[PDB]
């Protein structure tokens, strides 16, 4: 009966920024108060909805976008932002309703000697649309001379490794981010609250 939240917060393996995993969870009872008072997170910014009174509302269909970014890019996960993650990796709409949950995960997502398993898109041609997933890996045509498949010059590889070193600063550590989209409509709601 209870909604499964042990696969989006306690997942042993997360995904990269450009390949974030979207999970549809409906027809369940979901209590959100057990995450606020848990005191095991770092940011619990609820956009549109409030951090409280969310256990007394029935939602139509909520999602759970999970990915791993660095500490200096957590502010870009918000409605109406700019930079590199909100432009080419993960874009949030201006009317986004939900809560952005993030917590430090340097204790397990920082391999000794540089963890090269998490990637992020450095630059693309156009900006990313809200809730769009671009997993393309072709070289980025820059400059003026077309490379036509080869890397060479003026054509760089779009993906880039983070390099999560265990001995980094407070801004160069992994931060697992879970984005819940409380989609509300006049249709019969399925995700109710206690």
């Amino acid at each position, epitope marked *: 009966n209870l909604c499964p939240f042990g696969e989006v917060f306690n997942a042993t393996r997360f995904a990269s920024v450009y390949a974030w995993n979207r999970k549809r969870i409906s027809n369940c009872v979901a209590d959100y108060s057990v995450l606020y008072n848990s005191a095991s997170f770092s940011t619990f910014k609820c956009y549109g909805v409030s951090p409280t009174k969310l256990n007394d509302l029935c939602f139509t269909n909520v999602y759970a976008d999970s990915f791993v970014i660095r500490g200096d890019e957590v502010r870009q996960i918000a409605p109406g932002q700019t930079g590199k993650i909100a432009d080419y990796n993960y874009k949030l709409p201006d009317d986004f309703t939900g809560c952005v949950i993030a917590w430090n995960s340097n204790n397990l997502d920082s391999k000794v000697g540089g963890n090269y398993n998490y990637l992020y898109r450095l630059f693309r041609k156009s900006n990313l649309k809200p809730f769009e997933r671009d997993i393309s890996t*072709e070289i980025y045509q820059a400059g003026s001379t077309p490379c036509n*498949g080869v890397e060479g010059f003026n054509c760089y*590889f779009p993906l880039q490794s983070y390099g999560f070193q265990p001995t980094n600063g407070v801004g160069y550590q992994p931060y697992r981010v879970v984005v819940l989209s409380f989609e509300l409509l006049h249709a019969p709601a399925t995700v109710c609250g206690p």
Partner: antibody, heavy 120, light 109 residues
Framework: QVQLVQSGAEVKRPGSSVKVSCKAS????????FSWVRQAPGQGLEWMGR????????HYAQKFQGRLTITADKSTDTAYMELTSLKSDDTAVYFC?????????????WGQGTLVTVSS | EIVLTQSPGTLSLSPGERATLSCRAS???????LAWYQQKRGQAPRFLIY???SRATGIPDRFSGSGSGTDFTLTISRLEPEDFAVYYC?????????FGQGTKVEIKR
């Protein structure tokens, strides 16, 4: 600077597997892909496969899809090669190349080659 | 695209005369995707020219290439006694890279 040091020769028995290493040095290991090319005695060069360390994906040839297993250790900067069910006509000099991370590429940096004999 | 053949095969040339190696394409490589190498006897191939027109870093001006769609030629003017090895062709216009046979430049005595 860039020195793709390989291992030595391997006197191997017919019908087995081999494990050759390619110590990648100089620049970074993830910013460059790695391909292996063999050279049969007197014959030309044959492109076997190519590994992408940043993506951990491999692309084999039509005659090697299902027989060659190439890995890439992103910790010690070493590329490995393994061939299952070696036959008698596989005695060749296997070279280690450092191709770029693209669909089309050239084999600019080479290694030293290993004269791995299979008909022992 | 899939096969590359050298015309000379074993080009005997004097120590100082200019060389002309030929490597005809097979399926009309579009963007002149062809590279040349220098595989010395008992050594690794040396990268010489990318794109059939632009030489690599450190390559002397004696090496030069041409060809647009189906026939590329390598020009080695003033051949020194050191450039006596096999020269292979390599195309990257398609997905699988294919090599050639190689021209063994031998001394003319």
């Amino acid at each position: 600077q860039v020195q793709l040091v390989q291992s030595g020769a391997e006197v191997k028995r017919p019908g087995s597997s081999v494990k050759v290493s390619c110590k990648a040095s100089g620049d970074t290991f993830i910013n460059y892909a790695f391909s292996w090319v063999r050279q049969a005695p007197g014959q030309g060069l044959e492109w076997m496969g190519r590994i992408i360390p940043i993506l951990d994906i491999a692309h084999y040839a039509q005659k090697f899809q299902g027989r060659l297993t190439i890995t890439a250790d992103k910790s010690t900067d070493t590329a490995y090669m393994e061939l299952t069910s070696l036959k008698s006509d596989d005695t060749a000099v296997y070279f280690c190349a450092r191709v770029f991370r693209g669909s089309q590429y050239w084999f600019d940096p080479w290694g030293q080659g290993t004269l791995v004999t299979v008909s022992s | 695209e899939i096969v590359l053949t050298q015309s000379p095969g074993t080009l005997s040339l004097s120590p100082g005369e200019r060389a002309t190696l030929s490597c005809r394409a097979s399926q009309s490589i579009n963007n002149r995707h062809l590279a040349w190498y220098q595989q010395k006897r008992g050594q690794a191939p040396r990268f010489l020219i990318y794109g059939a027109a632009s030489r690599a870093t450190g390559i002397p001006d004696r090496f030069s290439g041409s060809g647009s769609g189906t026939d590329f030629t390598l020009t080695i003017s003033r051949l020194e006694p050191e450039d006596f090895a096999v020269y292979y062709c390599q195309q990257y216009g398609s997905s699988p890279p294919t090599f050639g046979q190689g021209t063994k430049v031998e001394i003319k005595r």
